[PDB]
Amino acid sequence: SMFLPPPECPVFEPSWEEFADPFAFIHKIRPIAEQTGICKVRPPPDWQPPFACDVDKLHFTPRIQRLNELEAQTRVRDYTLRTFGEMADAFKSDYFNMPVHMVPTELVEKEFWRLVSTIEEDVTVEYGADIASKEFGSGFPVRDIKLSPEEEEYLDSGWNLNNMPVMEQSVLAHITADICGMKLPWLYVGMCFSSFCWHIEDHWSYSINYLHWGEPKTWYGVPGYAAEQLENVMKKLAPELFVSQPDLLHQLVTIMNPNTLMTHEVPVYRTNQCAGEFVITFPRAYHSGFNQGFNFAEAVNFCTVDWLPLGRQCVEHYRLLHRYCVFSHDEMICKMASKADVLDVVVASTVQKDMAIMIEDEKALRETVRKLGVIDSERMDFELLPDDERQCVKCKTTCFMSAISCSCKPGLLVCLHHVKELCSCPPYKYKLRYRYTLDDLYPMMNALKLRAES
Ligand SMILES: O=C(O)CCC(=O)C(=O)O
Ligand SMILES: [Cl-]
Ligand SMILES: [Mn+2]
Numbered sequence: 001s002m003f004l005p006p007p008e009c010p011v012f013e014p015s016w017e018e019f020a021d022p023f024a025f026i027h028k029i030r031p032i033a034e035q036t037g038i039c040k041v042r043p044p045p046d047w048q049p050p051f052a053c054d055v056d057k058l059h060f061t062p063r064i065q066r067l068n069e070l071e072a073q074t075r076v077r078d079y080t081l082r083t084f085g086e087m088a089d090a091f092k093s094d095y096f097n098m099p100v101h102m103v104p105t106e107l108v109e110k111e112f113w114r115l116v117s118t119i120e121e122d123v124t125v126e127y128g129a130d131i132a133s134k135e136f137g138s139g140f141p142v143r144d145i146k147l148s149p150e151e152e153e154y155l156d157s158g159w160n161l162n163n164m165p166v167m168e169q170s171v172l173a174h175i176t177a178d179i180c181g182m183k184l185p186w187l188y189v190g191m192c193f194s195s196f197c198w199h200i201e202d203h204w205s206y207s208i209n210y211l212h213w214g215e216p217k218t219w220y221g222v223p224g225y226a227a228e229q230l231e232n233v234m235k236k237l238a239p240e241l242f243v244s245q246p247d248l249l250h251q252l253v254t255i256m257n258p259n260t261l262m263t264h265e266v267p268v269y270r271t272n273q274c275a276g277e278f279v280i281t282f283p284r285a286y287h288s289g290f291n292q293g294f295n296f297a298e299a300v301n302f303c304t305v306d307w308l309p310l311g312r313q314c315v316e317h318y319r320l321l322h323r324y325c326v327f328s329h330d331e332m333i334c335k336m337a338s339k340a341d342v343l344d345v346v347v348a349s350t351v352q353k354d355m356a357i358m359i360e361d362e363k364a365l366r367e368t369v370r371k372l373g374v375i376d377s378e379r380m381d382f383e384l385l386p387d388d389e390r391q392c393v394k395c396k397t398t399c400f401m402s403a404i405s406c407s408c409k410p411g412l413l414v415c416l417h418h419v420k421e422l423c424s425c426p427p428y429k430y431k432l433r434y435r436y437t438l439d440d441l442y443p444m445m446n447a448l449k450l451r452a453e454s
C-alpha cells in the first residue's frame with residue numbers, strides 16, 4: 001500500500017546507426033512510445049557530449065515551491081550553481097540523515113508522495129528554470145570562444161538540443177515569428193523533491209529532455225489518447241484549476257498522485273531518468289515528476305510531420321476553451337508553402353495535406369459569413385500585427401487567414417466563428433479582413449505538390 005509505483009515506460013537503446021538521425025528514430029519508436037506518452041532513450045555508450053561550466057559564474061534566481069498535492073501553482077534570492085548545490089546537498093542530507101547517494105530512489109519517491117499528501121508537513125524547496133541566455137547558456141556545445149575537437153564532434157549532433165529545433169524536419173524551424181519560449185532550450189537546476197506539475201506542451205508539441213548530470217529525475221507519463229480522461233479526473237478533484245485564465249502567463253497546474261489516476265483507470269507509466277539519458281514526451285502526453293537530488297537538465301519543444309494534424313486539432317481545442325495561442329498554426333503552414341522549393345520533400349507532402357484541410361475549412365467559413373450579410377472585404381497582412389492586436393475578442397485565437405472588423409470598434413477583431421460577438425451594428429457595416437483570396441491559396445498548395453513530386 002501507501003505508494004504503488006506505476007509500470008515502467010519503454011526504454012530504448014539505439015545502435016549508432018539508429019541514433020544517427022533523431023527524427024527517423026523518433027518516428028520508428030512512435031508506435032510503441034505513443035501508447036505510454038513518455039519514453040527513455042539511452043544513447044550509444046560512447047556518445048558523451050562534454051559538459052563544462054564555471055559553477056561560480058553562473059547565477060540564477062530560483063522559484064520557491066510548496067509541496068502540496070492538488071494545490072494550484074502557476075506554470076512559470078540569488079544563487080550560483082555552487083551555492084545552490086551546497087544548499088541542495090545539505091537539504092537532502094539533513095532530511096534523511098544520510099549521505100545523499102545512500103538514499104534509495106524508491107525511498108525518495110515513496111517519501112515524496114507521503115509529504116505532498118500530508119497537511120501537517122510544510123516542506124518548501126527551490127528549483128531553477130530558465131531560458132538559455134547570455135547569463136545562463138546551453139549545457140551542449142555551441143559555436144562561438146575556441147572549441148576543443150571533442151566539443152566539435154557534438155556541435156552538429158541532431159541530439160544536441162540547440163540543433164534539433166532547426167533540423168529542417170522540425171516544422172517549428174521555419175517559424176519567423178517570436179516563439180522564444182518554444183524554440184530555445186530551457187535549463188532546469190533541480191534539488192531533492194523539486195517538481196514539475198502535470199502538463200502537456202504548448203500546441204501539443206513533443207518535448208525532449210536531457211539530464212546533463214546529477215541525481216535522477218523521476219517521471220510519470222500518460223499517453224496522448226488518455227489526455228481527456230486525466231483532465232476529467234482532475235476537474236473533479238480540483239475544479240479551481242479549470243477556470244478561464246486572463247493570459248498564457250496564468251496557466252494553473254498541480255501535483256497529483258499517479259495512484260489516484262490509476263484508481264480512475266487512467267494509464268500511467270514511470271521512469272527514473274539518469275545522467276546522460278533522454279526522455280521524450282509525445283503530443284498531448286501529460287507528464288509530471290520530481291528530482292531525486294541536485295541535478296541539471298535541458299529540454300526543448302519540437303514538432304515533426306507526424307504532429308501537423310494534431311497541431312491543427314490543438315488550436316481548435318484552444319478555441320473551444322478560449323485559450324491563447326503561442327503562434328498561428330495557419331500562418332506557419334502558409335510560411336512553409338511560400339518556401340516550397342527549399343522544403344524537405346516529405347515535409348512538403350505533409351504540409352500540402354494540412355493546407356488542403358485549411359483551405360476547405362476557410363472556404364466554408366467565408367461562405368457562412370457572406371450569408372450572414374458581411375459583404376465588404378479588404379486584404380490584410382495579419383502577420384505584421386503584434387499577437388495582442390489580432391486575437392479574437394471572443395475565443396482569443398490568433399487570427400491569420402481572416403477576421404471580421406467593424407469601424408464601430410477600431411482595432412478589435414473576431415475570428416469567423418464569432419461574427420456575432422463583435423458588436424451590435426448590423427453585419428453590412430462589417431469588413432471581412434483576409435490574408436489571401438482562395439485563388440491565391442490554390443497555387444501555393446500546388447507549389448507544395450510539385451516539390452513533393454505528386
Ligand atoms: O524537468 C523539468 O522540470 C521539466 C521537464 C519537462 O516538462 C519537459 O522536459 O517536457
Ligand atoms: Cl504537504
Ligand atoms: Mn513538459
Ligand SMILES: [Mn+2]
Pocket residue numbers: none
Ligand atoms: Mn463559444
Ligand SMILES: [Zn+2]
Pocket residue numbers: 392393394395396397414415416417418
Ligand atoms: Zn473566435
Ligand SMILES: [Zn+2]
Pocket residue numbers: 406407408409422423424425429
Ligand atoms: Zn460595430
